[PDB]
Design a protein around this ligand. Structure first.
Ligand SMILES: CC(C)S(=O)(=O)NC[C@H](C)c1ccc(-c2ccc([C@@H](C)CNS(=O)(=O)C(C)C)cc2)cc1
Ligand SMILES: C=C(C)[C@H]1CN[C@H](C(=O)O)[C@H]1CC(=O)O
Length: 262
């Protein structure tokens, strides 16, 4: 018999956040956000009951080089702790080797966030100077993009980033944004275009996404290999795409209540 599906997700705005009064609420109603709405829609279309759970270690999915153990949401799928991950989980080769990804439900690319007024318009711009420091998260797909790259500009940027003092890496999105804002234009934060756009729409409206994206990829819903859930989840993403629901949800959580005008 079918079971209540365990959905692993993560606290990251505007994808998932706890409602302000979550202590007096229970279960799935404790949370709100893009991925909460998406989870609800996927569950509706696939006809399953589910329980939203926040990933234990608060990570996305990387494999320890020594222990070979997978962490984060990917880890929870791999080790049978959860049935599906619904989050801004970037589709990458190393992850798709061990879990199944649906077709992407949101597009994004690595992008540059600057404090307004920063004389930077592209990654090449960053790569040609040191006055304005720049960095990525200390773990995740962006950092890996830089570590792995064979492209000259990106390789130059990685070389700079790994040796820059003090460390140009940050541990959370909030930290990157905060560093940008506090640095009077002396720090630029490399982050997924989706988060960049989100933050750009929030007071005090002092950040800006600049330039084209450095790459082009997507977020996908993840399930363990051979899961019975994989096919219907994928078909559900397809259907929600074609009926305009994904566009509607992104507008809902990104732009509808934007605080920085039009
Ligand atoms: C990791 C990469 C291989 S990738 O991200 O999968 N594709 C690379 C290529 C540049 C690319 C990157 C992103 C997208 C893209 C296009 C659309 C979407 C959403 C809106 C819908 N995805 S869908 O499968 O086309 C749809 C019919 C449900 C999400 C991602 C399409 C192609
Ligand atoms: C927010 C985090 C740490 C996640 C979100 N997507 C990327 C991932 O799935 O690895 C990470 C962001 C990044 O690497 O810039």
């Amino acid at each position: 018999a079918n079971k209540t599906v365990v959905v692993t997700t993560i606290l990251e705005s505007p994808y998932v956040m706890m409602k302000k009064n979550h202590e007096m609420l229970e279960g799935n109603e404790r949370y709100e956000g893009y991925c909460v709405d998406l989870a609800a829609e996927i569950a509706k279309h696939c006809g399953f009951k589910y329980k939203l759970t926040i990933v234990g270690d608060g990570k996305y999915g990387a494999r320890d080089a020594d222990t070979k153990i997978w962490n984060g949401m990917v880890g929870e799928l791999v080790y049978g702790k959860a049935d599906i991950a619904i989050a801004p989980l970037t589709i990458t080769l190393v992850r798709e080797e061990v879990i199944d990804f649906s077709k992407p439900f949101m597009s994004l690319g690595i992008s540059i966030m600057i404090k307004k007024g920063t004389p930077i318009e592209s990654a090449e711009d960053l790569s040609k100077q040191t006055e304005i420091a720049y960095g990525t998260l200390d773990s995740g797909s962006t950092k890996e993009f830089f570590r792995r790259s064979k492209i000259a500009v990106f390789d130059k940027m990685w070389t700079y980033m790994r040796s820059a003092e003090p460390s140009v890496f940050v541990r959370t999105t909030a930290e990157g944004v905060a560093r940008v804002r506090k640095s009077k234009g002396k720090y630029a934060y490399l982050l997924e275009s989706t988060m960049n756009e989100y933050i750009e729409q929030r007071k005090p409206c002092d950040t800006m996404k600049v330039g084209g994206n450095l790459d082009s990829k997507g977020y996908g819903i993840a399930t363990p290999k051979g899961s019975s859930l994989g096919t219907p989840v994928n078909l559900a993403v397809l259907k929600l795409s074609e009926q305009g629901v994904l566009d509607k949800l992104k507008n809902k959580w990104w732009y509808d209540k934007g605080e920085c005008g039009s």
